[PDB]
Protein backbone atom coordinates (compact mmCIF):
# COMPACT_ATOMS: atom_id res chain seq x y z
CA UNK A 606 0.00 0.00 0.00
CA UNK A 607 0.96 3.61 -0.59
CA UNK A 608 0.83 6.22 2.24
CA UNK A 609 -0.02 9.95 2.54
CA UNK A 610 2.45 11.63 4.88
CA UNK A 611 2.96 15.03 6.62
CA UNK A 612 3.22 17.58 3.71
CA UNK A 613 -0.38 16.84 2.59
CA UNK A 614 -1.74 18.45 5.80
CA UNK A 615 -3.00 22.03 5.19
CA UNK A 616 -2.37 21.61 1.42
CA UNK A 617 -4.67 18.81 0.28
CA UNK A 618 -4.24 19.47 -3.45
CA UNK A 619 -6.29 16.31 -4.35
CA UNK A 620 -4.60 15.68 -7.77
CA UNK A 621 -3.96 12.19 -6.34
CA UNK A 622 -7.48 10.93 -6.61
CA UNK A 623 -7.80 11.34 -10.42
CA UNK A 624 -4.97 8.73 -10.83
CA UNK A 625 -6.54 6.02 -8.56
CA UNK A 626 -8.20 3.17 -10.63
CA UNK A 627 -9.69 1.65 -7.49
CA UNK A 628 -10.88 4.82 -5.70
CA UNK A 629 -9.24 4.23 -2.33
CA UNK A 630 -8.67 7.77 -1.06
CA UNK A 631 -10.59 9.06 1.96
CA UNK A 632 -11.14 12.65 2.94
CA UNK A 633 -10.50 14.64 6.05
CA UNK A 634 -10.98 18.44 6.66
CA UNK A 635 -7.32 19.20 5.82
CA UNK A 636 -5.72 15.80 4.87
CA UNK A 637 -6.31 12.71 2.71
CA UNK A 638 -5.48 9.11 3.53
CA UNK A 639 -5.21 5.86 1.46
CA UNK A 640 -7.02 2.71 2.49
CA UNK A 641 -4.29 -0.07 2.72
CA UNK A 642 -6.57 -2.91 1.98
CA UNK A 643 -8.00 -1.40 -1.21
CA UNK A 644 -4.80 0.13 -2.66
CA UNK A 645 -3.26 -2.16 -5.37
CA UNK A 646 0.20 -0.41 -5.32
CA UNK A 647 -0.24 0.90 -8.85
CA UNK A 648 2.04 3.89 -7.79
CA UNK A 649 0.15 6.13 -10.25
CA UNK A 650 -0.66 8.59 -7.58
CA UNK A 651 2.79 9.25 -6.28
CA UNK A 652 4.30 11.45 -9.22
CA UNK A 653 1.15 13.54 -9.28
CA UNK A 654 1.08 14.89 -5.67
CA UNK A 655 2.53 18.53 -5.70
CA UNK A 656 3.42 18.19 -2.10
CA UNK A 657 5.49 14.96 -2.85
CA UNK A 658 3.65 13.61 0.15
CA UNK A 659 2.89 10.09 -1.05
CA UNK A 660 5.36 7.22 -0.51
CA UNK A 661 5.35 3.42 -1.00
CA UNK A 662 4.86 2.02 2.53
CA UNK A 663 8.44 0.61 2.50
CA UNK A 664 9.88 4.03 1.39
CA UNK A 665 8.11 6.15 4.09
CA UNK A 666 10.78 8.35 5.93
CA UNK A 667 12.04 7.21 9.27
CA UNK A 668 10.57 10.37 10.86
CA UNK A 669 7.13 9.83 9.40
CA UNK A 670 6.51 6.12 10.25
CA UNK A 671 3.40 7.02 12.39
CA UNK A 672 1.55 8.04 9.23
CA UNK A 673 1.30 4.34 8.08
CA UNK A 674 -0.99 3.45 10.94
CA UNK A 675 -2.74 6.81 10.77
CA UNK A 676 -3.79 6.22 7.11
CA UNK A 677 -5.13 2.76 7.98
CA UNK A 678 -7.21 4.07 10.87
CA UNK A 679 -8.67 7.26 9.45
CA UNK A 680 -9.48 5.44 6.11
CA UNK A 681 -12.08 3.55 8.17
CA UNK A 682 -13.89 6.65 9.46
CA UNK A 683 -13.58 9.34 6.71
CA UNK A 684 -15.78 9.53 3.49
CA UNK A 685 -14.51 8.37 0.12
CA UNK A 686 -13.28 11.11 -2.32
CA UNK A 687 -13.02 10.22 -6.13
CA UNK A 688 -13.02 13.65 -7.78
CA UNK A 689 -10.38 16.37 -7.91
CA UNK A 690 -11.21 19.45 -5.88
CA UNK A 691 -9.53 22.93 -5.49
CA UNK A 692 -6.54 22.85 -3.13
CA UNK A 693 -6.91 24.37 0.31
CA UNK A 694 -6.73 28.18 0.19
CA UNK A 695 -3.23 28.67 1.46
CA UNK A 696 -1.69 25.45 0.28
CA UNK A 697 1.47 27.13 -1.17
CA UNK A 698 2.13 28.72 2.18
CA UNK A 699 2.06 25.36 3.94
CA UNK A 700 3.83 23.25 1.25
CA UNK A 701 7.30 22.44 2.70
CA UNK A 702 6.51 23.27 6.30
CA UNK A 703 7.62 20.46 8.53
CA UNK A 704 5.84 18.86 11.45
CA UNK A 705 2.37 19.70 10.22
CA UNK A 706 0.97 16.70 12.08
CA UNK A 707 0.31 19.09 15.02
CA UNK A 708 -2.33 20.75 12.70
CA UNK A 709 -4.19 17.61 11.60
CA UNK A 710 -7.97 17.82 11.91
CA UNK A 711 -10.34 14.89 12.56
Ligand code: SF4
Nearest residue numbers: 625644645647648650
Ligand atom coordinates in the same frame (compact mmCIF):
# COMPACT_ATOMS: atom_id res chain seq x y z
S1 SF4 B 1 -1.10 3.42 -5.36
FE1 SF4 B 1 -2.77 3.25 -6.83
S2 SF4 B 1 -4.38 2.09 -5.81
FE2 SF4 B 1 -3.04 2.89 -4.15
S3 SF4 B 1 -3.86 4.88 -3.52
FE3 SF4 B 1 -2.34 5.36 -5.17
S4 SF4 B 1 -3.55 5.30 -7.13
FE4 SF4 B 1 -4.88 4.38 -5.53
Ligand code: F3S
Nearest residue numbers: 613618619620621654
Ligand atom coordinates in the same frame (compact mmCIF):
# COMPACT_ATOMS: atom_id res chain seq x y z
S1 F3S C 1 -1.58 17.11 -0.98
FE1 F3S C 1 -2.87 15.37 -0.11
S2 F3S C 1 -4.84 15.61 -1.20
FE2 F3S C 1 -3.62 14.13 -2.52
S3 F3S C 1 -2.62 15.62 -4.00
FE3 F3S C 1 -1.13 15.34 -2.29
S4 F3S C 1 -1.85 13.46 -1.16
